[PDB]
Ligand binder design. Structure first.
Ligand SMILES: [Cl-]
Ligand code: NA
Length: 129
């Protein structure tokens, strides 16, 4: 599924991400545009060989098991495939654990590099609140 911007905002909020560990909603919506262009199915290899999955791009080395990444820890007890669904719950439960891993949203290179230090309220401007 490809989400709409405000559609994803409402699900992220429902799922308890608005202000989770202090990160407001334009952050998460912003992380999700640039990690995946809003697409629950997006998958991208990393050099280290790991793969990033889904609407936030949750990485198989620590976070989900894809069976082809050496040393996987599967710290969300989950199959990476299940993060590609249309039901963002497993991605948002795991994203809550990542962000809580100490470096905050820095765990997302695209957040650092492109969201951070910006007015990330443009990302929800026009959304029913
Ligand atoms: Cl933080
Ligand atoms: Na893993």
């Amino acid at each position: 599924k490809v989400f709409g911007r405000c559609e994803l905002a409402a699900a992220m909020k429902r799922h308890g991400l608005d202000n989770y560990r202090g990160y407001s909603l334009g952050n998460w919506v912003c992380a999700a545009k640039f990690e995946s262009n809003f697409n629950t199915q997006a998958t991208n290899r990393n050099t280290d060989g790991s793969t990033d999955y889904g609407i936030l791009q949750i990485n198989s080395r620590w976070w989900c098991n894809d069976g082809r990444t050496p040393g996987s820890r599967n710290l969300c007890n989950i199959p990476c495939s299940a993060l590609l669904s249309s039901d963002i719950t497993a991605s948002v439960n795991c994203a809550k654990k990542i962000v809580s891993d100490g470096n905050g949203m820095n765990a997302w290179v695209a957040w650092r590099n492109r969201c951070k230090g910006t007015d990330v309220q443009a990302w929800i401007r026009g959304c029913r609140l």
